[PDB]
Structure formats: C-alpha cells, structure tokens
Amino acid sequence: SMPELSPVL
Amino acid sequence: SMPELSPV
Amino acid sequence: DHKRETERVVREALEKLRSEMEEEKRQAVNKAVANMQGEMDRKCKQVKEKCKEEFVEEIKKLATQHKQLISQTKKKQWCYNCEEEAMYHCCWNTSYCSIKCQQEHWHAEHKRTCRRK
Amino acid sequence: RMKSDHKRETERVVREALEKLRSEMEEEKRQAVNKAVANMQGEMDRKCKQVKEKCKEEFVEEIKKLATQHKQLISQTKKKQWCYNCEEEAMYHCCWNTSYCSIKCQQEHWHAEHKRTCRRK
Ligand SMILES: [Zn+2]
Ligand SMILES: [Zn+2]
Ligand SMILES: [Zn+2]
Ligand SMILES: [Zn+2]
C-alpha cells in the first residue's frame, strides 16, 4: 500500500 | 485563472 | 712633581663628572621608558578595540549570510528522511530524494500519517 | 714662569679629559636608553600578543557555536513548509515547491511570476 511515487522536477 | 486554494 | 698633581685632580674631576652624568643617564632612561610605556598602552588599547570591532563585524556578516541560506532553504523541497534535496512528492510536507528514503520513512512512521490518495 | 705654565698645563689636560669623558658618557647614555627601550618594547608586545590571542580564541569558539546553531536551524527549516511570497510558514498548497501562508501572498506571487509557471492540475 506504500504509494508508487513518480519524479517531480 | 488563479487556482482556488484551501488550507491543508 | 707636577704630573702627580695633574693626574690627581684630573682623576677626581673625571670621577665627579661621571658621577653626575650617570644620574643624567638614569633620568634619561626613566623618561624614555615612561614615554614608551604610555605610548605602547595607547597603541595596545587601540589595536584590541579594532580587533573586537572586527569580531562584531564578522558576527554580523555571518548572521546575514545565515539568513540568506535560511531563505534559500525555505525556497526548496527537502527529503524528510536524509534532508537532501527532494525528487519525489508523497504528500504535504513529505517528499524524498530516493525510493530508499521513501520506503525507510514509510515503514518507520509514514504508513500511519500519509495524507496521500 | 713655571708656576703659571703648570696651571695652564693642568687646565688644558682637565678640559680635554672632561670633554672625552663627557662624549663617552653621552653615547653610553644613548645605548642605555636603547637597551631599556628595546627590552620594554618586547615585554609590552609579548603581553599584547597574549591578551589579543586569548580574545581571538574566544571569537573562534563563538563563531563555531553560531555555526552549530545555524546547522540545527537549517534542519528545522528543512522539516517545514514555507510561503514562497513572504517567508512565513505555509498553510495553502498550490503545487510543487509552491505553498503560501495566505491568499494575499498567493495573489502577489501569482502576478509576480507564478502565473507563467504554476503546474497545478
Ligand atoms: Zn533522502
Ligand atoms: Zn504521504
Ligand atoms: Zn506569505
Ligand atoms: Zn502553483
């Protein structure tokens, strides 16, 4: 359930 | 065009 | 003869003149020493006060610099785990530099408080 | 004739002996002055270096205390969200690295630059 994060920048 | 913001 | 007389009076005259001039010498030495005493004290206080004012000025430079670094820090996002610059956004006041830090912090506490989707 | 010449004789011997001694005593005096002053200089300077360097060390230690304080404050700052317009603590989230303490600040930063840069959905 730990969210998959995408890079911000 | 300025987004309406609410307190977090 | 005459030489004994001359030698006598010359000797005693030399002793008397020497006696007076060594008193002159003692007085000149004392005077010079007092003059440099006061002079060196003035130069001393002067230098100490300039050095302390230098300290104050440096303290204020450092304070200003620190303020600007605080501002720069405020204008950036930081990893909640290692406090390096963030590259991933989770939720409010919660970003990370890496997936490693994200999962570390997740299993450490963030499971319980995550305000994300 | 000789009771006079002996007197003159003696007088000139006394004169030149006194002049020679007086000169000797003069630069002996000058050297004694030089010695006393050169020694006194060093004593004064040495005392000066001691006091001054103690002060300089107090300064260095104070600087290090300040640096440490700053380090901690940097960390605390890193654990908070801040208004981008003014630098008070933030309570409104717009988008990435862009939060505000108030709507007023939001509008100010909006018209200043954030209008052209807002990445909010
Ligand atoms: Zn990290
Ligand atoms: Zn989260
Ligand atoms: Zn503000
Ligand atoms: Zn925005």
Residue numbers in the entry:
A (entry chain D): 381 to 389
B (entry chain B): 381 to 388
C (entry chain C): 445 to 561
D (entry chain A): 441 to 561
Paper lines:
The crystal structure of BS69CC-MYND (residues 440–562) in complex with EBNA2381–389 was determined at 2.4 Å resolution. The structure of the BS69MYND domain reveals a ββα fold that was observed for other MYND domains. Two zinc finger clusters, formed by a Cys4 motif and a Cys3His motif, respectively, are arranged in a cross brace topology. The coiled-coil domains from two BS69CC-MYND molecules further associate to form a homodimeric fold. Consequently, the two MYND domains within the same BS69CC-MYND dimer are brought in close proximity. Association of BS69CC-MYND with EBNA2381–389 is mainly mediated through hydrogen bonds and van der Waals contacts, involving a surface area formed by the α1-helix and β1-strand of BS69CC-MYND. Notably, the side chain of BS69 Q546 forms direct and water-mediated hydrogen bonds with the backbone atoms of EBNA2 P383 and L385, respectively; and BS69 M531 and H533 form direct and water-mediated backbone hydrogen bonds with EBNA2 V388 and S386, respectively. The three conserved residues in the PXLXP motif of EBNA2381–389: P383, L385 and P387, all make contacts with BS69CC-MYND (residues Y532, C534, Y540, Q546, W550, C558 and R560) through van der Waals contacts. Additional intermolecular contacts involve the residues flanking the PXLXP motif: EBNA2 M382 makes contacts with BS69 Q546, Q547 and W550, and EBNA2 V388 is in close proximity with W536 from a second MYND domain within the same BS69 dimer. The engagement of W536 from the neighboring MYND domain in the BS69MYND-EBNA2381–389 interaction implies that the BS69 coiled-coil domain plays a role in enhancing the interaction between the BS69MYND domain and EBNA2.
